[PDB]
C-alpha cells in the first residue's frame, strides 16, 4: 500500500512541524554556582504560544532578562529568589531537598541541572512526599511515584492557567486556531473511513475495522495502529 | 609511563646526563633504540638510558624487562631531546647505552647503585 499518516509524521515536513519561529522561550532554570544571592523582580506576565499557560518575565540582580514558567499568584512587582537557601514562597526555585514534604511543586528536574522536565502544563503539580539522604519521592500529575535525586531543582506552587480543560471548544474553528499554534496535523480522518491502500482499517462496503483493534507491541510502523498494546479495553468489567 | 615503574628525581637525572657527556668524550656510547637493544643482548652494556616521553611507547617498551634478564642497569630520563644532546646529537634519542665507560666508571657505578635502592 501507501505509507500511513503516522509514517509521514516522522519525516518532519512543514505540515507536521511546530511553528518554532513563533515561539517565545525554552523555559529553563537559571544556572547558579552555589549560594543564594540571586533574586529578581517580575516585570511582565506574557502568553506563551507553545503551552497556552502564562509565562513570567523576570529581571535578575545581575541584569538578566529571561522568561520563566509562571506559577499561580505571581504578579508584577513581586520578588522571586533562586538558589539553595531560597525562601519557601510560591514561585521560588530551590532543590527538592530544601523543599518541605507535603508541598505542591512544579517544573521538576529529571537529572539535576537540566532545567525542568516534569509538571509544566496548565494547573498541574507534583507532590513531594518522602525524604532521605539518597532519594526524594515525588508524585507526578499522572499519580506515579517518581523516585528522584534531592539535588533536582523545582519551583514551588501549581502551574498557572488552571482549569483550561474545563470549558469546551464548542466549535471546530476554535480547535483550528489552537492547532495552528502546535505541532499537530488537524483534522483527523478515521482510518476506517479511508481506502485499504491507505490504512490497515481502510476498505470494505461499510465502515468497520478489518482485524481486531488491539495491536501487539512488536508490530512494525505501518501496522501499529488502533489500540497499541492495550492491557484491556472498554469501560465495564 | 607503562614501562616506567619508578620516578627518578631531577638531581639523579642531572648526575646521569653529566656522566653520559663524559662517556662519549673518553669511552664509547651507543645512540638510538636499535643500538641500545643490541648492546643489552651482546652483553656489552654497562648502563642504559631510556626516555619517558617516547610516543609511541612501543619503541622503548621492551628495555625494562630485557635489562632485568640480562642484569644490565637502567635509568629514566624525562625528556627525549636532552638524552640526544647528552649523547652528542642535534636530534633527540629515545634510548642511549654506555658501551664501556671512561673516567666516569666510579660515577656510573654509584648511579647504578642509587637506582637499585629506588627499586
Amino acid at each position: 500500500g501507501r505509507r500511513i499518516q503516522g509514517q509521514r509524521r516522522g519525516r518532519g515536513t512543514s505540515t507536521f512541524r511546530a511553528p518554532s519561529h513563533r515561539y517565545k522561550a525554552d523555559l529553563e532554570h537559571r544556572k547558579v554556582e552555589d549560594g543564594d544571592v540571586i533574586a529578581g523582580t517580575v516585570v511582565d506576565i506574557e502568553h506563551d504560544p507553545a503551552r497556552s499557560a502564562p509565562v513570567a518575565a523576570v529581571e535578575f540582580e545581575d541584569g538578566d532578562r529571561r522568561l520563566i514558567l509562571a506559577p499561580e499568584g505571581v504578579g508584577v512587582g513581586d520578588e522571586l529568589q533562586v538558589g539553595v537557601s531560597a525562601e519557601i514562597a510560591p514561585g521560588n526555585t530551590l532543590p527538592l531537598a530544601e523543599i518541605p514534604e507535603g508541598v505542591p511543586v512544579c517544573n521538576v528536574e529529571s537529572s539535576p541541572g537540566d532545567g525542568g522536565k516534569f509538571a509544566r502544563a496548565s494547573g498541574v503539580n507534583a507532590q513531594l512526599l518522602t525524604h532521605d539522604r539518597n532519594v526524594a519521592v515525588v508524585k507526578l500529575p499522572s499519580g506515579e511515584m517518581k523516585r528522584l535525586d534531592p539535588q533536582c531543582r523545582a519551583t514551588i506552587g501549581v502551574v498557572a492557567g488552571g482549569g483550561r480543560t474545563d470549558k469546551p471548544f464548542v466549535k471546530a474553528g476554535n480547535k483550528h486556531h489552537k492547532m495552528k499554534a502546535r505541532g499537530t496535523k488537524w483534522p483527523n480522518v478515521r482510518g476506517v473511513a479511508m481506502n485499504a491502500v491507505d490504512h490497515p482499517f481502510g476498505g470494505g462496503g461499510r465502515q468497520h475495522p478489518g482485524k481486531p483493534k488491539s495491536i501487539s507491541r512488536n508490530a512494525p510502523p505501518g501496522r501499529k495502529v488502533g489500540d497499541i498494546a492495550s492491557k484491556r479495553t472498554g469501560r465495564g468489567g | 609511563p607503562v614501562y616506567v615503574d619508578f620516578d627518578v628525581p631531577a638531581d639523579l637525572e642531572d648526575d646521569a646526563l653529566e656522566a653520559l657527556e663524559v662517556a662519549r668524550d673518553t669511552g664509547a656510547v651507543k645512540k638510538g633504540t636499535n643500538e641500545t637493544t643490541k648492546s643489552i643482548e651482546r652483553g656489552s652494556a654497562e648502563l642504559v638510558f631510556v626516555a619517558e616521553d617516547v610516543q609511541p611507547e612501543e619503541i622503548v617498551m621492551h628495555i625494562p624487562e630485557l635489562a632485568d634478564e640480562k642484569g644490565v642497569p637502567f635509568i629514566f630520563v624525562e625528556q627525549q631531546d636532552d638524552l640526544g644532546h647528552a649523547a652528542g646529537l642535534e636530534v633527540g634519542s629515545a634510548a642511549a647505552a654506555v658501551t664501556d665507560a671512561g673516567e666516569a666508571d666510579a660515577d656510573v657505578e654509584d648511579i647504578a647503585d642509587k637506582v637499585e635502592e629506588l627499586r
Binding site: - | 614501562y3 636499535n34 643490541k38 643482548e41 609511541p56 612501543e58 617498551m61
Partner: protein
C-alpha cells in the same frame, strides 16, 4: 642478534596481552575522540611501517583512519525484487575495511599517493588503520631509489584503482595458480566473476 623492531612486532602478535593491552585501552580513549582521518608524526608500529616501505624522510606521511565495524549499510529495495535480491541485513561489501580506510585517507590528502596500510586495532564498533602516504612531488622522494616509482604518471590515484597491496589481496590476486582463474589480470577482464 634481535633488532629493536622485532620487539614491537612480537608485541603486536597478541594485542590483547601484556603491556600493549594497557596501552590500547588508554590510547583508544583518545582515538575515539579524534577524527576520521588524523595525521600522526610517527607510526604506532615502526617495524610494520618500515617493512611496508616507510622511511623517516620528507614527504612520507602517516595517518590514522577509523572506519565503522560490520556489514553493509544498505537501503532496502523500493521496487520489485525477487526473493534472492531482497536482502538487507546479511549483505556484506566486496571491499574490506582496510581498503575503505586507505581511500578515506587518500581523499583527505589529494596530492599524496597511498604506499600501504596496517591495522592498529579495534573496539566493539570501529576499526583503526594507519596509512603510509607519499608525496610524488617532493624531490626528497623523486631522488629516492626505493620510493621514486610512485612518482610515475600511471601511479596517480592508485588506491582507487586497487593497485595497493590491500587492493591486490582483496582482488583475489595472491595465488598465482589454482583458484585465480577469474581474478588475474583483472576482475573486470574476467566479467566480474571473482
Amino acid at each position: 642478534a634481535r633488532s629493536a623492531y622485532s620487539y614491537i612486532r612480537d608485541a603486536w602478535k597478541n594485542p590483547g596481552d601484556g603491556q600493549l593491552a594497557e596501552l590500547q585501552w588508554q590510547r583508544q580513549q583518545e582515538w575515539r575522540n579524534e577524527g576520521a582521518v588524523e595525521r600522526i608524526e610517527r607510526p604506532t608500529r615502526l617495524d610494520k611501517a618500515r617493512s611496508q616501505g616507510y622511511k623517516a624522510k620528507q614527504g612520507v606521511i602517516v595517518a590514522r583512519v577509523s572506519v565503522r565495524k560490520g556489514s553493509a549499510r544498505k537501503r532496502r529495495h523500493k521496487a520489485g525484487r525477487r526473493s534472492k535480491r531482497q536482502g538487507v541485513t546479511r549483505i556484506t561489501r566486496r571491499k574490506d575495511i582496510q581498503r575503505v580506510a586507505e581511500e578515506r585517507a587518500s581523499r583527505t590528502f589529494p596530492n599524496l599517493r597511498v604506499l600501504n596500510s596496517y591495522s592498529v586495532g579495534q573496539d566493539g564498533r570501529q576499526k583503526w588503520h594507519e596509512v603510509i602516504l607519499i608525496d610524488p612531488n617532493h624531490p626528497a622522494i623523486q631522488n629516492d631509489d626505493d620510493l621514486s616509482w610512485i612518482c610515475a604518471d600511471d601511479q596517480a590515484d592508485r588506491v582507487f584503482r586497487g593497485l595497493t597491496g590491500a587492493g591486490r589481496r582483496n582482488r583475489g590476486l595472491s595465488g598465482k595458480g589454482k583458484g585465480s582463474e577469474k581474478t588475474r589480470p583483472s576482475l573486470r577482464s574476467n566479467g566480474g566473476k571473482g
